[model samples]
Target: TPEMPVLENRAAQGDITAPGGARRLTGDQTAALRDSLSDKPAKNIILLIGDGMGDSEITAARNYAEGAGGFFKGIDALPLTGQYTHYALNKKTGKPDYVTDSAASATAWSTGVKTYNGALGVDIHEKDHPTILEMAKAAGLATGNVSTAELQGATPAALVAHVTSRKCYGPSATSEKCPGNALEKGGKGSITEQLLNARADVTLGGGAKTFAETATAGEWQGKTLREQAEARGYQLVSDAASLNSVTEANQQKPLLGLFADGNMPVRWLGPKATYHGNIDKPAVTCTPNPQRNDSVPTLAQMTDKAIELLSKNEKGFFLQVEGASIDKQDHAANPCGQIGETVDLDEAVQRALEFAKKEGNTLVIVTADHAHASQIVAPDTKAPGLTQALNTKDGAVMVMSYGNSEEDSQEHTGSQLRIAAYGPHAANVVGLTDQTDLFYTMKAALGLK
Candidate 1:
């Protein structure tokens, strides 16, 4: 097991109120900067995606969890940092669509192709493109997909399944929304079905509900997807205890752990932002969600376990972990929910970094699929949008607002996102790049043809 990094209080470093007190650098950093560069090929790749975790979301989380001047030990620890543009193409015009959804953004990195919103593992023309995960697996590398969302969610599904619609999770949905991709139509079936065919060594997270849907067409056509998985040699585990007891996972006996029926419960809960709520209500602290129990493993725990299981492959591995609900919470206008998920993702990143630093040949990348709606607003200003005040770790009141939509769910924003990396090939992420470039970078890092 790798040792976790200790987080330090930035306030202890100096008087934050004084000039230069909050500065992160003490002297020239050219030497350290040069040392951070690496072009060597990596034996393993761990990609961490904080969905909709734009700079604003990250700043808010840092402000709440580690104070305004503080840095996240995991998210901020990556030595090579850069920015990437994530834009989806419009299906009608094949031109750039300013705003991108999760599915399209995920496809950009997973398949190295710009896709339309709602498309997964396919191009804007509905052409199938092999994802980096599939290519890595074909090259004999172990692969794992872990997420806080349903396994069939856009991020995870983009890596393993090709479907016209991201919502086509099970047979029924595929039959309705993506008839061309349905199994009975002589195509690849639903996202859940293709995930089974993709056969990554380890697949964890929620969406147990979809597995209960019977296969409309296939070898196990009459059986439920759960039965099909079991009959096909999947070592199914629903809880942390069973997952911990598993000794191995491979092509023959892959591990499938589904902890929830839908998307997994988020880490924390608090007041949802409302119109002028920041000024009307007092700032409140976040509280742990009682729905999250010992039975469900945290993102960090899942990441740790995924690395442990995948590293046994001598041919190396490619693992994708997603802190999915940052986007979900952001959509719901819940400041605490998004912040807590960001904190959760940071812990997972910490685990990956610890392993990468110790292993030497691992390439660990931390990034987000798209920008989101949350924004830090002036504490005294009353915006027309949903707003809330949070009591941060700094004992400061931070006002956050979700103005993307006046409706129930906030909207995703069109913006470049932060991309950071560590270990071999880390330098590849050290500048502006397109999201699609990530596929080539990881493919090159693993020396995958």
Candidate 2:
């Protein structure tokens, strides 16, 4: 993704504004807008979020996945294509921050409104805005959120919960930033309770620690959420073996799965090293210690189950599957890890493609909420004309160079990002578009209010 340099300067001057500057259309204009929408709404929608999978990351992963040469994953072959600008306004300044985080960017697409960084499903004023998932559920559709990050992570939470702070994930949250009114209304100000009560039908991801019961210091603590979910008629699964065994019978019931204490394990194939913005940093490889409990399920496996379960709804379903580790690895400038996780995400896209192809009534969207500064750079060992001779045996080798995120700077950049769509109404995304436009596009395509 390339940053729009002039727009950044304009944003800095508070001169860059949103398309049409947020005004209501005239009655006939509104009617015309409605008339332009698809006559046949999609029966099922799968939104694949590649968190921080920027242009460099995607290309790197594509090259790596192909080994010598080949096209990118099935996602790149999607018919509709467009670049989405990711810029959010600051709560105080009311001008574009020019760079966005997952929470704000996801909120825009989820709610059809722009918000401040770190906010969930709220505007810059911290006012709650109903999300597309909420709208889907209200319209009698099944809904699910799946992530490689914490289930309560910003991207997933923005889909189902309305909170002021992304950090307020559990009932135990004492952050002053947690919405006081939400806390007052429900003894829990946490996204966790909101999510449990939201009853999206199926919530599968990680961050068991964010759930109330498991974080407490007692043997019975771990079972609290499990019990609550069961009481609510949810079939709970904690591991890959259990998740795989889940039958259509289980899909008929509400479902909840927590696979890790924090984020899920990275889907890397080689040794993992702590990235320090440079390839030559001291290497200390961590043991392959995946977070809490074995039977690790790949993102694709989770996607398969989510679709199977959600597809049971006669009214259709709305599902969000996130490839989250791309950002996490990029933040640390870990090329191998980021690229591997991107391929993992691509496999998830493959699952969506297969489903959409079979169902025909399904719409599959693959996009990034924002971009990372990690980039694939030429393996230049003699950039400043160094005397050290490069290792000569390599026929082909590429390396990642950290951009703005390196040298103790912000990891995200004000870069334009890509969105690719396949199946049903995918043609709506074939040009330059704003991130918030996605909400309206999906709503129109799905015939949601």
Candidate 3:
């Protein structure tokens, strides 16, 4: 095996809470948390990374999804808003640090160190850093990971791969630092290769081609990662219909679902049930048919399905599900956009809440990796909804209108991002914090060492 002992050894300790690892909350943060005793504590941690999200984008996302603010706090299932920070080491420029990439920003939380922008699950020196996923699994707990991007994209990929650069996709051609990222080297590694190699309990999302033998001719290793995942005993499902049957049925084994060749269908541009292509669609939406299948599930539906299938585990499962495309929208830094995609993300959070309610002791920590291009409205009393106007797309400050941001020149902000939580350890997220703090928070929430 590709040195499973290192993985086994690191994972054996659970989460890294050693002095050199993530630090527990300081005294001031503790005092501030006392103010919200009414809120719940977290058991399972759900870290939502709205990659490239900024205060403006977040506010707009919330507003556009829920509409007018006078709605019920918990009734409409809105995310509890708070603030978070971001500061990563620049790759070439060094020093005072520059704009953070999803890889390094995520590494701070997953590995607890400020690394160069392009590295995944590695530290500033490009060393293999243990992840929350491996730690959890080594501790004898059931672990699962899912994403809307290629199953191995940065968001979910951060928890699995050991790369020194995140820009391994497109162009670079196959460098030793990331042999699998064909875009970077045309050599090795796509999210699937490293991830499936980990043997995570549950794995879902798109990007099957990279793990296939044909991804780069020789590097494919003949049998794809997903193929190995199934060979090792996983009930793999590829589309919404298949996803539904698995979630609804009584399965006794872990699932290795690879819905699309690349990132799954984007929700806002849905074909979940209508005009479904690629995989076979089932006749009955809820019926179980091994031979029959369905379209891919939406982000929210995927969350629901993950909870349904993994919930059965006696050990209680740890699942990392991502609203993959939110960043794609921001990277485009649109001026004429719907940003309705965030609505689907909001729905996914609701799905988590549904699961949290059913499974007591579940600690759900919701936060973002970095801010986006939109700028949140800093209360302008004369501007009407200005008191809460969000940096929406299409210029005008909008709460729920089909917005289009105009102020920002496509550059991200250093503004504090959102950090919402629930479950047993949720009370810990009352005040503002740095994005890296999520790792410690997660470990504390689950009582991991």
Model number with the top TM-score: 1
Off by over 4 Å in 1: 1-12
Cα misplacement distance, residue 220 of candidate 3 (Å): 8.4
Lowest-sum lDDT 10-residue window in model 3: 1-10
**Cα lDDT tens digits for candidate 2, 239-299:** 9998878765233476788888889988653333223322454322222334423587889
The 0-to-1 C-alpha lDDT of every candidate, in the order given, reads 0.91, 0.71, 0.56
* Number of the candidate with higher lDDT, 1 or 2: 1
Q: Give the TM-score of candidate 1.
A: 0.97
Model 3, residue 16: C-alpha shift (Å): 49
Candidates 1 and 2: which is better by TM-score? 1
lDDT of 1 by residue, 227-311 (tens): 9999999999999999899999999999999999999899999989989998899998999999899999999999999999999
Against the correct fold, how does model 2 do in TM-score?
0.81
List ranges where model 3 is wrong by over 4 Å.
1-43, 70-81, 91-96, 169-190, 214-220, 247-253, 269-294, 335-338, 376-411
